[PDB]
Amino acid sequence: MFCGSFMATGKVILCYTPPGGSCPTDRESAMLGTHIVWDFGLQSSITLVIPWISGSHFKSINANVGYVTCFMQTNLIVPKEAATSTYIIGFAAAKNDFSLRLMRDSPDI
């Protein structure tokens, strides 16, 4: 969700790297992968659907399962009266196909 002024406008690139790939380093690499050209001037919020993630415990640590990256396609444009700085907040959730197994003790004391 883009929490900017009403007349604030701009574009960002929301890339998603599948597991095993390399996260993009510039906007060109992001555009070549799966992406959405989010324009927050019109749409105040955007939704991404990650196809699938997995992981467990096996020193062995589960490998990376992908990245979600944002690149700034244009520059932010605001009126004179509006603030020159804006903010973006994000949320996460899971679908009805999520599952869990082997209940254990949480490290968080």
């Binding site: 597991p19 467990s56 096996f58 589960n62 490998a63 599952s99 197994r101 968080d108 004391i109």
Partner: protein, 217 residues
């Protein structure tokens, strides 16, 4: 340091049921007392250990029946002659009844307090405590006070209806010639668990047993 990956195949959701999530028999108390306080006394609660407290605090109201298992171990002191098969009495005192003050107290003979007589060399004692609350569900979070007067304003978040009762354990034939040290382990297994109104999990470390204060880290 090894980044290994495995294909995960899963199906079914009965594992993540709240009944299974909270239906694990966990240690709630563990105390040691000598031959001659002279006996075991402890009011039943869940918040004693941080793990189980955090597990329970994810919900606002939980109603359940309590199954208690007592596992006693005896360790001798200083010549040797074997581990005595001492008889143990475990009595549940409800919230509206007095609790004993000594080993040879009168409340040990109360007919209204359930009592279990078990021996050391026997299987651990086990009994089920039904849901014994005035309200229809236990309240882990209380945004209120007990009364309208002083000496109660210092008890914020304490609801008298949320107490679960007192469990008292003694050794009937306590007096023995030499010595012994008895360790009591209490295992609580909630049953018929129902929960309401989930809450965000606790993040900051606990600062007190009954006041939900928080500190850094």
């Amino acid at each position: 340091a090894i980044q290994t990956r495995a294909v995960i195949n899963q199906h079914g959701t009965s594992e993540t049921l709240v009944e299974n999530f909270l239906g694990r028999a966990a240690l709630v108390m563990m105390k040691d007392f000598e031959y001659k306080q002279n006996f075991f006394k402890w009011t039943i609660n869940t918040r004693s250990y941080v793990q189980l407290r955090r597990k329970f605090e994810l919900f606002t109201y939980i109603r359940f029946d309590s199954e208690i298992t007592i596992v006693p171990t005896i360790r001798l002191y200083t010549s040797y002659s074997g581990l005595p098969n001492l008889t143990l009495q475990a009595m549940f005192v409800p919230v509206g009844a007095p609790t004993p003050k000594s080993q040879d107290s009168y409340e040990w003979q109360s007919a209204c307090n359930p009592s279990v007589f078990f021996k050391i060399d026997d299987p651990p004692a086990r009994m089920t405590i039904p849901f014994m609350c005035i309200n229809s569900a236990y309240g882990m979070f209380y945004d209120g006070f007990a009364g309208f007067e002083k000496t109660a304003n210092g008890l914020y978040g304490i609801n008298p209806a949320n107490t679960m009762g007192n469990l008292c354990i003694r050794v009937v034939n306590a007096y023995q010639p030499v010595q012994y040290t008895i360790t009591i382990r209490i295992y609580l297994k909630p049953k018929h668990i129902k929960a309401w109104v989930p809450r965000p999990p606790r993040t900051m470390p606990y600062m007190s047993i009954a006041n939900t204060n928080y500190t850094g880290h």
